[PDB]
Design a protein around this ligand. Structure first.
Ligand code: I2P
Ligand code: CA
Ligand code: CA
Ligand code: CA
Length: 513
C-alpha cells in the first residue's frame, strides 16, 4: 500500500513489458539473453558477452545475479537509465575523432559579442559571459575593443547603451577558463576600435596575461594549410585585421587575418590564403548559399568562414546554425546567452566528440572537388537515405516548468529533424492531461533522412496550454551519428542547457537503410 504506493508510484509497464520480451519467461536475463537484446534491439556493434558482462558488473544491483552473471529487471532498468542506455552515444561523449586535420575541416564552437549577457542595445556586458561560454565549450570568442578611460581599453557594444568591461579583466577570465572544457585551441576574434595607443596597451595585456598560451608565431612547418586542433592544443590564437593598426597587435595575427570576402576562387586557382578568414552576416551568407552553394562548400574546405547574426537581432535572438553548417561554414557564431532551439541544436552538435569544441566535418565537405550543394542534391556519397522510427513511449518525472502555482503539466512531445532542407521535418504526440510524473504516449513517428551526415534529431517537451503558448519543459538534441538504437532514455535539459536530474523520455529507436 505504502509499500504498494512506492512500488506503484514506481511501476513502469513499458519497462516490464520490455524485460519480459527480452527475458521471456525467466525472471532474469542470462548473458546469452542480454547479448541478444543488445544485438537485436539495442543494435550494438561491440555486441558480445564482454559488453553484456560490463553492463551487469556495472548496473546489476543484485549480488546474486551479479555474481552469477545475470541481469534482473532492476539492473535492466538501471542500464536503461545509465549513460549506456542514453540515446546520446556514450562513446561520442569523449574526443574520438581525427584531430589532426586543418582547422578548416572542423566545425568550431563560436559565439557572438560574447561579452554580452542579454540584448545588444542596453543589456549588460560581463566577464561572466565569457566564462559561461567557455564553460559551455565555446572555442571562438568575440571581443569588441574600444578606448576607455585612464588609457585602459574597454569592451562593450559600440554605439549602444551596453554596459562596459575591461579588456584586461576579460583576458584573465579567458585565461582561466580557456581550457576548462577542452584542451583545444581558442580563437579570439578582435573587433578593434582602439586608438593606436590603446592598441599598444592591448598588445601588452595580451602577452602579459596570456603569456605562453598566446600563439604569437607560426608553427614550424604548417606551410600550405592551417595547423590542426592538435598542433594548436592549449594555445589561444588571435583573429583580426593584419597590416590605423599598430604592429604590436597586427604582428600577433598569424592564422586568422580578417579579410573582406573576395569571391570563391573556382574561376581561378586561389582567392583567400588558408590563413585568411572572411566573415558573413546571416543574410549575406544565405545569399551566397542560395546562389553559390558549391561555391562556398569548396571554399570552406581549405578556408575558415565566420558567420554572425543579422543586425536586426537586437534581442540577441539566433538563427539556425544548420543552414550554415550545410555550406561547410565552420565558425557559425550564435548568441550563446540564447535560450532557444538554435542553441539547443548548437550545443547538441558540439556535445559530440567529447564536447571538445571541434567536430570534424563530413568527408564530402572536406573534398576540395566536391559537387555537393545541400540546396541542389544530386547523387553522391552524401546521399544515403535512411528510415528512422522513433517511438515516444513515455516520460518520467517531467520538471514542473515554472508555474507560479500548483498545477500539473499537460505534456506533449515534439520530435524534429534538422538537416538539409529536404530532410527537415517535425511531428508531435498528443497531450496528456495533468501528468508529468509518468505520462505515457506510446506514439511512433517515422522520418526519411537522405543526408544523415548532416542531420540532428530533436526531442522537445512542451506543457500544453489551450489559452496561451505552451511552456517548454525540456529538450535534447542528438547528432544523427550519435543516435543510439533500441530502448533508450532521452535526458532532458533546461532552456539553459542545464541537465535535469531525473527528467527523461523513454523511447525506442531504429534506423534502417
Ligand atoms: O554584431 P557586431 O557587434 O556588429 O559585429 C558583427 C558585425 O556587424 C561587425 O561589423 C563584424 O565586424 P567587422 O565590422 O570587422 O566586419 C563582426 O564580425 P567580424 O569581426 O568577423 O568581421 C560581427 O560579429
Ligand atoms: Ca562585435
Ligand atoms: Ca494541467
Ligand atoms: Ca497546462
Amino acid at each position: 500500500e505504502i509499500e504498494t504506493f512506492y512500488k506503484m508510484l514506481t511501476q513502469r509497464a513499458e519497462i516490464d513489458r520490455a524485460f519480459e520480451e527480452a527475458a521471456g519467461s525467466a525472471e532474469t536475463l542470462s548473458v546469452e539473453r542480454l547479448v541478444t537484446f543488445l544485438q537485436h534491439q539495442q543494435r550494438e556493434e561491440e555486441a558480445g558477452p564482454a559488453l553484456a558482462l560490463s553492463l551487469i558488473e556495472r548496473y546489476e544491483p543484485s549480488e546474486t545475479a551479479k555474481a552469477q552473471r545475470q541481469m534482473t529487471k532492476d539492473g535492466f532498468l538501471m542500464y536503461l537509465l545509465s549513460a549506456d542506455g542514453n540515446a546520446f552515444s556514450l562513446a561520442h561523449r569523449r574526443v574520438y575523432q581525427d584531430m589532426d586535420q586543418p582547422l578548416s575541416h572542423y566545425l568550431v564552437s563560436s559565439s557572438h559579442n560574447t561579452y554580452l549577457l542579454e540584448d545588444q542595445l542596453t543589456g549588460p556586458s560581463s566577464t561572466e559571459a565569457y566564462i559561461r561560454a567557455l564553460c559551455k565549450g565555446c572555442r571562438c570568442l568575440e571581443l569588441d575593443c574600444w578606448d576607455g578611460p585612464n588609457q585602459e581599453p574597454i569592451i562593450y557594444h559600440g554605439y549602444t547603451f551596453t554596459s562596459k568591461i575591461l579588456f584586461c579583466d576579460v583576458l584573465r577570465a579567458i585565461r582561466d577558463y580557456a581550457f576548462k572544457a577542452s584542451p583545444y585551441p581558442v580563437i579570439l576574434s578582435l573587433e578593434n576600435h582602439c586608438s593606436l595607443e590603446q592598441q599598444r596597451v592591448m598588445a601588452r595585456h595580451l602577452r602579459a596575461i596570456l603569456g605562453p598560451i598566446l600563439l604569437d608565431q607560426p608553427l614550424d612547418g604548417v606551410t600550405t594549410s592551417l595547423p590542426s586542433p592538435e598542433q594548436l592544443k592549449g594555445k589561444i590564437l588571435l583573429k583580426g585585421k593584419k597590416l590605423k593598426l599598430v604592429p604590436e597587435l597586427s604582428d600577433m595575427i598569424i592564422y586568422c587575418k580578417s579579410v573582406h570576402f573576395g569571391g570563391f576562387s573556382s574561376p581561378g586557382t586561389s582567392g583567400q590564403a588558408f590563413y585568411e578568414m572572411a566573415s558573413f552576416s546571416e543574410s549575406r551568407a544565405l545569399r551566397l548559399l542560395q546562389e553559390s552553394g558549391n561555391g562556398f562548400v569548396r571554399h570552406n574546405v581549405s578556408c575558415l568562414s565566420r558567420i554572425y547574426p543579422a543586425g536586426w537581432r537586437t534581442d540577441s535572438s539566433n538563427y539556425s546554425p544548420v543552414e550554415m553548417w550545410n555550406g561547410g561554414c565552420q565558425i557559425v557564431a550564435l548568441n550563446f546567452q540564447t535560450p532557444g532551439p538554435e542553441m539547443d541544436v548548437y550545443l547538441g552538435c558540439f556535445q559530440d566528440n567529447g564536447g571538445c569544441g571541434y567536430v570534424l566535418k563530413p568527408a564530402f565537405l572536406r573534398d576540395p572537388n566536391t559537387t555537393f550543394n545541400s540546396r541542389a542534391l544530386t547523387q553522391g556519397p552524401w546521399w544515403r537515405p535512411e528510415r528512422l522510427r522513433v517511438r515516444i513511449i513515455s516520460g518520467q518525472q517531467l520538471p514542473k516548468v515554472n508555474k507560479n502555482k500548483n498545477s500539473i503539466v499537460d505534456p506533449k512531445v515534439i520530435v524534429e529533424i534538422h538537416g538539409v532542407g529536404r530532410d527537415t521535418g517535425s511531428r508531435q504526440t498528443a497531450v496528456i492531461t495533468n501528468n508529468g510524473f509518468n505520462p505515457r504516449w506510446d506514439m511512433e513517428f517515422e522520418f526519411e533522412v537522405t543526408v544523415p551526415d548532416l542531420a540532428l534529431v530533436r526531442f522537445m517537451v512542451e506543457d500544453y496550454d489551450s489559452s496561451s503558448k505552451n511552456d517548454f519543459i525540456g529538450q535534447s538534441t542528438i547528432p544523427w551519428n550519435s543516435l543510439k538504437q533500441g530502448y533508450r532514455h532521452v535526458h532532458l535539459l533546461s532552456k539553459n542547457g542545464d541537465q535535469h536530474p531525473s527528467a527523461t523520455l523513454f523511447v525506442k529507436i531504429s534506423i534502417q537503410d
